[PDB]
Amino acid sequence: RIISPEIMPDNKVTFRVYSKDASKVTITGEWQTGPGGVEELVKNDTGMFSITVGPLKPELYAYNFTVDGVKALDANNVQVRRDGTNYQNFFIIPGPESDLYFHKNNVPHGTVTKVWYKSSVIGFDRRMYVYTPAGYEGDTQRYPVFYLLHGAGGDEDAWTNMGRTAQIMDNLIAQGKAKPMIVVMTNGNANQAGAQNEVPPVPMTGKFEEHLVKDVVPFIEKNFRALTGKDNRAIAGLSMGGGHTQTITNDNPGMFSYIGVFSMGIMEKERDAKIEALKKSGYKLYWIACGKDDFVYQSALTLRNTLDKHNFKYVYRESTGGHTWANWRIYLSEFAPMLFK
Amino acid sequence: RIISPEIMPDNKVTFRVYSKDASKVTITGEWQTGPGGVEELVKNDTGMFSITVGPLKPELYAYNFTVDGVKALDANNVQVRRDGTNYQNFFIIPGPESDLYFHKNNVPHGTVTKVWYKSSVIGFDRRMYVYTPAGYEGDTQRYPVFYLLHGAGGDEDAWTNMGRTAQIMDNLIAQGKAKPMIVVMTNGNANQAGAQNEVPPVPTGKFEEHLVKDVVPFIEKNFRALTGKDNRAIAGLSMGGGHTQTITNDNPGMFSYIGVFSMGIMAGADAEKIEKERDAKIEALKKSGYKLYWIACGKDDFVYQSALTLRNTLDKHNFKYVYRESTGGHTWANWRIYLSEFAPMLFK
Ligand SMILES: O[C@@H]1[C@@H](O)[C@H](O[C@@H]2CO[C@@H](O)[C@H](O)[C@H]2O)OC[C@H]1O
Ligand SMILES: O[C@@H]1[C@@H](O)[C@H](O)OC[C@H]1O
């Protein structure tokens, strides 16, 4: 039996790959410096390649191997994630910064529902994922709703798979840090019916955004025990989805009171008029989060300046790092506790 | 820029792996006969390894590569399944025998819900998957319920992932071949809270007792379920076919449609006393008003003789069943076939 990864008491991590045939086995992982920082495993006489890295800071880290030039996952690690077409293994180093990302056996767990709905706007049925809080079943309580949008290359599975949304929400809700809430994760690619690993291509500017308001929101409010109205609605998205969030809220002032723009910036006289209408809409939070090293940083500054021009109040969270799921998990973790308060 | 697998118009399939630095790439796949059936890809002078196999009969086939002694999936194939800890790619050769396994864009799709429930019997909360038929949302109709159980090594994700349950049910229901129904896929491992790829380990007869005392009431409370035996079906494969027998034998009159896939006689205590209890349970079930007892098994399965022993014992009791013998053995290919044939029989 081969243990890989093996997390040590000092948060070093050992990885192992067996092969007497292979010449070179490397590992690519999210703790590394960059492409030049790929690391080579050391082969012993027995055929075992191994490497120990770290100590690593608490976080979720994805990785894979490369065996004589071919990508290979870690067959001894059952934890596998998917980012579009890119599959990688992962592990989580325990500690304060990663604690919300674990699936804990002593925490009540919310349901994840993969549900299809008709779309009058797009013209074919589409799939979304809906998280409901623990204890939703068997009760009559109604809950506010948070619409959570992915970026380019993603799909309705991404926020749970890459973003650990079910764990983050289970843990925040159980800890009393976020209110119980329904989280709705749409597929933001209007040409798709659902995630490409399960749903084939179907045999469009503005259509996703229009469909969220005209098709998704009514379906959620009809088919789930949802509170209604702007103070019970939140919306956030990353990158492309942060653009969707702006378009949706700019075009529908007074529909969402909690608005989050993750790793995205600006995308006219119409623009200024829509800011003025949104400014007067009674919103409660406009939260902009971006990493200092993200290529979109300057565009996010332009967004902030454009809001400043209108004396439009927002909160800005600048973080370390760049355009990564590590940052998007952090942003979700910080934004969800702000909602519906 | 690399297509792999490339399914050709004649149902041959080409696989490709690129690396100038690799020495040997082989492929392991379900069209092969045994471990000595692994096949070597041929390397061209530009670093592309390739092989063309087939023609293959219509079916879903899983596969992976081995690169210089290390398992590797096909990075150009987004279709990946999981059997416990074993991940493999797959593809589906179109044709009559595989058509139900495709996700079709012109077919209404049922919801798959991953829901947690308290278990008084097991003592901690557990996860199951529930399929509801297309159009469940937004309507008031109630639906009969089919409990579908996996075997050893599986979990509540297996029947949808390995078994293509959502596609089979969507397609059968849309074609009018099976009635709209709720399909409940439990985790049959009483020591687990949920599937090992998502849920960590937790700090007998318990599964079977919990299905009746915890799962069924939760489904009937929280889903729009018709109830009573004529609205209730249960089937399972291997270990889950054993669970199916134990549950139905211990609760005669609770299920009208019973499916035993790739499983035979249950082990028991003296040999005679076991047979007396077994006889009594057969007789009570015989008189229970059930509608269908369906036994399906591959002729090459190790369990074949035990399933024959079961059939012979039922014959001795004049207990009416239907037997479906198939080609092949103890495989998800057969379990998909069995689901595809059993679901159209239910609730009619
Ligand atoms: O899930 C997607 C991420 O994978 C994507 O990340 C970008 C991918 O291309 C690289 O060149 C960029 O550096 C990297 O940020 O971001 C969008 C998200 O939807
Ligand atoms: O891998 C198979 C498993 O999925 C099933 O549960 O029992 C038989 C095994 O061969």
Tokens of A334: 């910080």
CB neighbours of residue B225 within 10 Å: 19
Per the DSSP assignment, residues forming a β-bridge with B149 are B236
Q: Tell me the CA distances in angstroms from B237 to B241, B265, B291, B338, one per residue in order.
A: 5, 13, 20, 9
What's the A154 CA to ligand 1 centre distance in angstroms? 9
Q: What are phi and psi of A58, to 5 degrees?
A: -60, 130
CB neighbours of residue A182 within 10 Å: 25
B17 and chain A: CB distance < 8 Å anywhere?
A: yes
Q: Do B226 and B255 belong together in one domain?
A: yes
Q: State the DSSP code for B320.
A: -
Q: For residue B236, which of B339, B133, B306 has the smallest C-alpha distance?
A: B339
Q: For residue B197, which of B237, B165, B157 has the smallest C-alpha distance?
A: B157
Q: What is the 3-state secondary structure (H, E, C) of chain A?
A: CCCCCEECCCCCEEEEEECCCCCCEEEEECCCCCHHHCEECEECCCCEEEEEECCCCCEEEEEEEEECCEEECCCCCCCEEEECCEEEEEEEECCCCCHHHCCCCCCCCCEEEEEEECCCCCCCCEEEEEEECCCCCCCCCCECEEEEECCCCCCCCHHHHCCCHHHHHHHHHHCCCCCCCEEEECCCCCCCCCCCCCCCCCCCCCHHHHHHHHHHHHHHHHHCCECCCHHHEEEEEECHHHHHHHHHHHHCCCCCCEEEEECCCCCCHHHHHHHHHHHCCCCCEEEEEEECCCCCHHHHHHHHHHHHHCCCCCEEEEECCCCCHHHHHHHHHHHHHHCCC
Q: Is A149:A174 a contact under the CB 8 Å cutoff?
A: no
C-beta B188 within 6 A of ligand 2: no
**CA gap B348, B337 in Å, rounded:** 20
Burial grade of B112 (CB within 10 A; 0-12, 13-18, 19 or more): buried
**CA gap B51, B187 in Å, rounded:** 38
Q: Do B250 and B327 belong together in one domain?
A: yes
Beta-carbon contacts of residue B35 (< 8 Å; ≥ 6 apart): none
Is the bond leading into B55 cis (omega within 30 degrees of zero)?
A: yes
Q: Is A295:A263 a contact under the CB 8 Å cutoff?
A: no
**CA gap B126, B202 in Å, rounded:** 10
**CA gap B249, B234 in Å, rounded:** 12
The resolution, in angstroms to one decimal, equals 1.2
Q: Which residues of B touch A22 (CB under 8 A)?
A: 67-70
SS3 content of chain B, % helix, strand, coil (to 5): 30, 25, 45
B100/chain A closest Cα distance in angstroms: 14
CB neighbours of residue B312 within 10 Å: 10
C-beta A144 within 6 A of ligand 1: no
CB contact under 8 A, A19 and B137: no
What's the A181 CA to ligand 1 centre distance in angstroms? 28
Number of domains in chain A: 2
Q: For residue A8, which of A121, A126, A64, A91 has the smallest C-alpha distance?
A: A91
**CA gap A36, A151 in Å, rounded:** 27
Q: Do B141 and B288 belong together in one domain?
A: yes
Q: Do A305 and A214 belong together in one domain?
A: yes
Q: Which residues of B touch A219 (CB under 8 A)?
A: 137
| Nearest ligand 2 atom, CA B84 | 4
Per the DSSP assignment, residues forming a β-bridge with B40 are B26
CB contact under 8 A, B113 and A111: yes
Beta-carbon contacts of residue B72 (< 8 Å; ≥ 6 apart): A67, A70, A71, A72, A73, B17, B64, B65, B66
Tokens of B161: 């992932």
Query: How many residues are recorded in chain A?
Result: 341
Name the domain boundary from A41, A61, A94.
Answer: A94
Q: State the DSSP code for B55.
A: P
Name the domain boundary from A37, A72, A94.
Answer: A94
Q: Do A34 and A120 belong together in one domain?
A: no
Mark the breaks in chain B: residue after which each occurs, C to N over 2.5 Å.
Answer: 203, 268
Tokens of B329: 């053995």
CB contact under 8 A, A115 and B116: no
CB contact under 8 A, A73 and B72: yes
CB neighbours of residue B309 within 10 Å: 13
User: First-to-last CA distance in chain B?
Assistant: 50
Burial grade of B162 (CB within 10 A; 0-12, 13-18, 19 or more): buried
Q: Do A41 and A125 belong together in one domain?
A: no
Per-residue burial over A130-167, b = 16 or more CB atoms within 10 Å of its CB, e = otherwise? bbbbbebbeeeeebbbbbbbbbeebbbbbbbbbbbbbb
Tokens of B319: 């207990």
Q: Do A60 and A192 belong together in one domain?
A: no
**CA gap B277, A121 in Å, rounded:** 62
Q: Do A247 and A282 belong together in one domain?
A: yes
Positive or negative CA dihedral for B257, B262, B264, B267?
Answer: negative
Out of B87, B237, B261, B301, give the residue to mutate to test ligand 2, the one with the largest number of ligand atoms within 8 Å of its CB.
B237
Consecutive H or E run containing B276 = helix B271-286
B52 dihedral zone (left: phi>0; alpha: psi -120 to 50; beta): beta
Consecutive H or E run containing B131 = strand B126-132
Q: Tell me the CA distances in angstroms from A154 to A169, A195, B43, one per residue in order.
A: 20, 8, 34
A40 and chain B: CB distance < 8 Å anywhere?
A: no
CB neighbours of residue A44 within 10 Å: 9
Q: Got the DSSP string for B157-215?
A: THHHHTT-HHHHHHHHHHTTSS---EEEE----TT-SS-TTTSPPP---HHHHHIIIII
Could you identify the residue written with the tokens 């973080």?
A319
Q: For residue A206, which of A265, A246, A266, A151 has the smallest C-alpha distance?
A: A246
CB contact under 8 A, B21 and A78: no
Tokens of B248: 């139905």
Q: Do B237 and B336 belong together in one domain?
A: yes
Task: Return the beta strands (E) in B241-312 as ranges.
Answer: 257-261, 292-298
A75/chain B closest Cα distance in angstroms: 7
Judged by CB atoms within 8 Å, which residues 264-293 of A form the interface with B?
Answer: none
Q: Do B142 and B281 belong together in one domain?
A: yes
**CA gap B197, B214 in Å, rounded:** 24
Per the DSSP assignment, residues forming a β-bridge with B64 are B28
What is the distance of C-alpha A130 from the center of its chain?
A: 14
Q: For residue B61, which of B32, B34, B36, B86 has the smallest C-alpha distance?
A: B32
Beta-carbon contacts of residue A33 (< 8 Å; ≥ 6 apart): none
Q: Name the method of structure determination.
A: X-ray
Q: Tell me the CA distances in angstroms from B151 to B47, B264, B296, one per residue in order.
A: 42, 13, 15
**CA gap A232, A184 in Å, rounded:** 13
HSE-up of residue A190 (Cα within 13 Å, Cβ side):
18
Name the domain boundary from A94, A116, A132.
Answer: A94
Range of the domain at A20: 1-94
What's the A324 CA to ligand 1 centre distance in angstroms? 7
Q: What is the 3-state secondary structure (H, E, C) of A69-94?
A: CEEECCCCCCCEEEECCEEEEEEEEC
Q: Tell me the CA distances in angstroms from B269 to B121, B266, B272, B274, B277, one per residue in order.
A: 25, 14, 8, 7, 11
Q: Which of B114, B169, B171, B192 best probes binding to A when mutated, by most A CB atoms within 10 angstroms? A: B114
Q: Do A263 and A141 belong together in one domain?
A: yes
**CA gap A86, B114 in Å, rounded:** 24
**CA gap B252, B185 in Å, rounded:** 21
Q: Is A286:A308 a contact under the CB 8 Å cutoff?
A: no
Q: For residue A273, which of A239, A312, A316, A229 has the smallest C-alpha distance?
A: A312
Q: Do B317 and B231 belong together in one domain?
A: yes
Q: Is A288:A259 a contact under the CB 8 Å cutoff?
A: no
